[PDB]
Amino acid sequence: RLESENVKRLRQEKRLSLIVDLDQTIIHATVDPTVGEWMSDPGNVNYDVLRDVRSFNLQEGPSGYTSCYYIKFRPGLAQFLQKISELYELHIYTMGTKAYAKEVAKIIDPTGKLFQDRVLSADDSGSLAQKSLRRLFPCDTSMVVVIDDRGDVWDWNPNLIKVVPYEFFVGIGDINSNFLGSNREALEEQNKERVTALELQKSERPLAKQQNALLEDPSHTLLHNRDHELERLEKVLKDIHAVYYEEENDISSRSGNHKHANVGLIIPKMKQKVLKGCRLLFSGVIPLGVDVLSSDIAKWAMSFGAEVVLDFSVPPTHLIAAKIRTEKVKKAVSMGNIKVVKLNWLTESLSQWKRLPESDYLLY
C-alpha cells in the first residue's frame, strides 16, 4: 500500500519528491588536516570563509582507521532546504557510506525534520556504481526530481537536474568517488583502497601545497565563497513544481483522475529550449576511439536540445574545440558561418541553462 499511497499523499500536500546528492551538490568534504589548522587561527587568510565549516570523526575499515572530515555547506543551504522542503519531500541518496551520510545529516538536519530517515547510502542502495530512481520509486517515477552534480551516475535520466559541482576546497574532488563505474570488489579490497586514498589526502596536504604556492608567487588566499548555485537551483525547482501542478490539475481533471502529469516529460521540455537549433561538432574533446554520441558531454548537451554531428557534411553551428591546431578547426574557419568555441562555452551554458555569448569563448 505504501508506494501508491505516498504518491497520493504527496499530491494532497501539493509536493513532489526530491532526491538530493551530498558530495559536490550540497556539501564539499575533505580530510586534509590543513583545514583544522586554518580553522584554529583567526588571523589566517582562510579563517573567515571557514567559519561555517563543521567536522566529524569516523572510524573506517577493519582496523578502525579514524579520520576527521571537514564539511563545507554550500552557500544558502539552510534556506534552500527550508524553502524547497515546502514543495518537495526530501531524500538523501549518496555513494558515501551510511555512517558518512548519517554524520552529514546530523549537521544539516539535527532533529530529522527535513529528511527523517529518508537517507540512502552505499550500504543500502544496492549499487556502488550507479543510482536508480527505482530503488525509491520502483513503479511510478512521475513525481521525483533528482539534484546531483553527476549525470553519469543517473545514466542521464530525464528527471535529473545536474548541478555545477561544488568545489570549495580547491583541488579536492569527491572523497566518495572511489568505486563509481566499477565492478564490486571484496570488502577487503574496498577497505584497503579507501584507507589508502584517505591517508594520501592527509599526508599530501593538497590545500597547504596550493596555498603555499599562491603565497610564494584576495588573490593570494586559496579559499573563497563565490558560489550562488543554490539560488539558481531554487528557481528551477520552483518552476518544475509549478508546471507539474498546473499540468496535473489539467490532466487529472480531463481524465477523471485516471491520468497524471510527469516530471520526466516536463523537465526535458524545459531543458530543450536552451540549445535548441545548435548543431555541435567536437574537436579534441572526446578521446580518439571513444564513441561520441554516447559520451557524457554529448548526452548532457543533447538533454538541452543540441544536436551532435560527427563531420561537416551538414555544417554544424558550433565547433567545440580543445586545441586550435586541428584540421577540424581549419576547416570550420575556412568554411565560415561556424562558431569555433572552447569547451567552456558549452559547459558554462549548460550549467546556467542559458546560451552564453560565443564571442566570450573564442579559441587562441
Which residues contribute to the site for Mg ion (CB under 5 A)?
21, 23-25, 149
Q: Give the shortest CB-252-to-Mg ion separation in angstroms.
A: 35
Task: Tell me, yes or no, if 140 is annotated catalytic.
Answer: no
Q: Is 191:133 a contact under the CB 8 Å cutoff?
A: no
Q: Which of 23, 109, 148, 174 is catalytic?
A: 23
Inter-helix orientation angle 229-254/77-85, to 10°? 10
Residue 11 or 150 having the CB closest to Mg ion: 150
Q: Give the shortest CB-100-to-Mg ion separation in angstroms.
A: 12
Of 62, 70, 85, 88, the closest CA to residue 245 belongs to 88
Q: Is 300:326 a contact under the CB 8 Å cutoff?
A: no
Which residues make Cβ contacts (< 8 Å) with residue 118, sequence separation at least 6? 89, 90, 91, 92
Of 27, 354, 351, 356, the closest CA to residue 164 belongs to 351
Task: Tell me, yes or no, if 52 is annotated catalytic.
Answer: no
Burial of residue 190 (number of CB atoms within 10 Å: 0-12, 13-18, 19+):
middle
Residue 25 or 349 having the CB closest to Mg ion: 25
- The identity of residue 172, as a single letter, is I
Q: Give the shortest CB-163-to-Mg ion separation in angstroms.
A: 9
Q: Give the shortest CB-126-to-Mg ion separation in angstroms.
A: 18
Q: Give the shortest CB-23-to-Mg ion separation in angstroms.
A: 4
Residue 152 or 247 having the CB closest to Mg ion: 152
Residue 21 or 109 having the CB closest to Mg ion: 21
**Measured distance between the N- and C-terminal CA atoms of the chain, rounded to whole angstroms:** 61
- The identity of residue 79, as a single letter, is Q
Residue 144 or 338 having the CB closest to Mg ion: 144
β-pair partners for 59: 66
Of 317, 302, 308, 15, the closest CA to residue 162 belongs to 302
CA 264 to mean position of chain CA atoms: 18
Which of the residues are catalytic? 21, 23
